[PDB]
Design brief:
Length: 66
């Protein structure tokens, strides 16, 4: 999960400069729901674990709502 990296490509957290993943609707420190305004970078490229869970989550969530 979003443990932390030197060159993050997600969104920055105001409550703390942790910067979580772009596809992570919630900081792993403050738990502040990602701002809908924020967008995900096309060149994101989620890790093997990130995509493994993301691709599946959206397959059950996105497929429903979106
Ligand atoms: Zn936050
Ligand atoms: Zn935070």
């Amino acid at each position: 999960g979003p443990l932390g990296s030197p060159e993050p490509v997600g969104w920055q957290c105001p409550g703390c400069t942790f910067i979580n993943k772009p596809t992570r609707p919630g900081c792993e420190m403050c738990c502040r729901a990602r701002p809908e305004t924020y967008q995900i970078p096309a060149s994101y490229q989620p890790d093997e674990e990130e995509r493994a869970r993301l691709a599946g989550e959206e397959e059950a969530l996105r497929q429903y709502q979106q």
